Design a protein around this ligand. Structure first.
Ligand SMILES: [Ca+2]
Ligand SMILES: [Ca+2]
Length: 90
C-alpha cells in the first residue's frame, strides 16, 4: 500500500521530538492560525531576507515544491522539502 512514498518517507525519518523543532517555526511562516500555508503568505517571511518579490514570481517558487496539485504548503509537504536535502549529502 505504498502510493504516497514522497512524504511517507520524510514522516518515518523525522520522529515526534524532531517534528516539534519545526512546529514552532511552522506557525510563524503561515500566520493564518497554523493549518496550511500558501504562495502569498509565504512571500512575506521570504522578504525578511532583503529583496523585492512579486505575486507572479511567488507562484513559480511553489511550482518547484508543489508536485501534488493542492497548491498550498501544509505540514504534510514542508517536512518532505527539508528531508530531500537531509538525504545523504544532496
Ligand atoms: Ca494559511
Ligand atoms: Ca502542495
Amino acid at each position: 500500500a505504498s502510493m504516497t512514498d514522497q512524504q511517507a518517507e520524510a514522516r518515518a525519518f523525522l520522529s515526534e521530538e524532531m517534528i516539534a523543532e519545526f512546529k514552532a517555526a511552522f506557525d510563524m511562516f503561515d500566520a493564518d492560525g497554523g493549518g496550511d500555508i500558501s504562495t502569498k503568505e509565504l512571500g512575506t517571511v521570504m522578504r525578511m531576507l532583503g529583496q523585492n518579490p512579486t505575486k507572479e514570481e511567488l507562484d513559480a517558487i511553489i511550482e518547484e515544491v508543489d508536485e501534488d496539485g493542492s497548491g498550498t504548503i501544509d505540514f504534510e509537504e514542508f517536512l518532505v522539502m527539508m528531508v530531500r536535502q537531509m538525504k545523504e549529502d544532496a
